[PDB]
């Protein structure tokens, strides 16, 4: 994912530096397991003059429905940021030992 | 699914050269992640490392064994060859052929299919 | 020029037995090694990676820690298709050492 190209009088190449791509990919594996593990019915019926309880029902039901979307979206919405940051944060510090 | 196997003539007198080939079957020299590796082990010994070869051309060969040592990259005919010489009784072993992954990917984020992060071993040929 | 050690070379155990086996290297190898086990007459296999991580289809009994100098891989029951030699494989530098070997009976 990172690397290196160089050109002297030998020649010009590319290369890649391991130890950064394999700490991106221990990062990355973690938080979408991560995403996977923290998010780890079959129907009711009633006759007519039970509208009340119905009603109920279906409000739970429709309630729990748009919390856990929401909370799926907004996650989702979160961690590409943090992935992609991350991304341009490692870039930066082989930019800076190399300097050093 | 990949598999390495090896080819060599095996009849080889003392103080002249010694060729094999490892091909390929399956999908191919593949270019992201692999270090193609010859690892000999003598009857009667342990392991012993020969060398390896990352797929654009550079090389990386024992310290002990850098008198007379060749590898070779071909990408159309999917193979790669190693080249000895001075083969004694010492030198007379069964030679393995291996493609070890750069990268230890379990859940298969980096390399996609799950196989491609398998270090998938020769069959392995005696040469005396 | 880093080299391995291993100890003891012999193994002998009966059947559902601990087995806790060590790598030694002098110098400091940050978690780079690797098990190979050997059946006789053939090709050897990848157990672990990198000293904590196992590979896809490997069965849960073999497990491994360790770091810095030392290394330790335990099987915690033992089977009749066990029979093999295992190796450490260190890649810390561009220089490849394995172990000596250590066989199980």
């Known amino acids: 994912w990172y690397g290196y190209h160089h050109q002297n009088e030998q020649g010009s190449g590319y290369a890649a530096d391991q130890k950064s791509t394999q700490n991106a990919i221990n990062c990355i594996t973690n938080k979408v397991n991560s995403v996977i593990e923290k998010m780890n019915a079959v129907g009711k019926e009633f006759n007519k003059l039970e509208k009340r309880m119905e009603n109920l029902n279906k409000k739970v039901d429709d309630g729990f429905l748009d919390i856990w979307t929401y909370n799926a979206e907004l996650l989702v919405l979160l961690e590409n940021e943090r992935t992609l940051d991350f991304h341009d944060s490692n870039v930066k510090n082989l930019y800076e030992k190399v300097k050093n | 699914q990949v598999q390495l196997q090896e080819s060599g003539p095996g009849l080889v007198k003392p103080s002249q050269t010694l060729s094999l080939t490892c091909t390929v079957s399956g999908g191919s020299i593949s270019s992201g992640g692999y270090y193609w590796s010859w690892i000999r082990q003598h009857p009667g010994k342990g392991l012993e490392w020969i060398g390896y070869?990352?797929?654009?051309?550079?090389?990386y060969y024992n310290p002990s064994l850098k008198s007379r040592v060749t590898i070779s990259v071909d990408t159309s005919k999917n193979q790669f060859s190693l080249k000895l010489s001075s083969v004694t009784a010492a030198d007379t072993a069964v030679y393995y052929c291996?493609?070890?992954?750069?990268?230890?990917?379990?859940?298969?984020?980096?390399?996609?299919?799950?196989?491609?992060?398998?270090?998938?071993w020769g069959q392995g040929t005696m040469v005396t | 020029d880093i080299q391995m050690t291993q100890s003891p070379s012999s193994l002998s155990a009966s059947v559902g037995d601990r087995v806790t086996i060590t790598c030694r290297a002098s110098q400091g190898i940050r978690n780079d090694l690797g098990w190979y086990q050997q059946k006789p007459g053939k090709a050897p296999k990848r157990l672990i990676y990198?000293?904590?991580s196992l590979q896809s289809g490997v069965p849960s009994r073999f497990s491994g820690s360790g770091s810095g100098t030392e290394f330790t891989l335990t099987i915690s029951s033992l089977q009749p298709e066990d029979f093999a030699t295992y190796y450490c494989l260190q890649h810390n530098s561009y220089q490849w050492t394995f172990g000596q070997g250590t066989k199980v009976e």
């Open positions: 291996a493609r070890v992954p750069f990268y230890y990917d379990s859940s298969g984020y980096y390399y996609g299919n799950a196989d491609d992060a398998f270090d998938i």
């Open positions: 990198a000293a904590s």
């Open positions: 070869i990352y797929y654009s051309g550079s090389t």
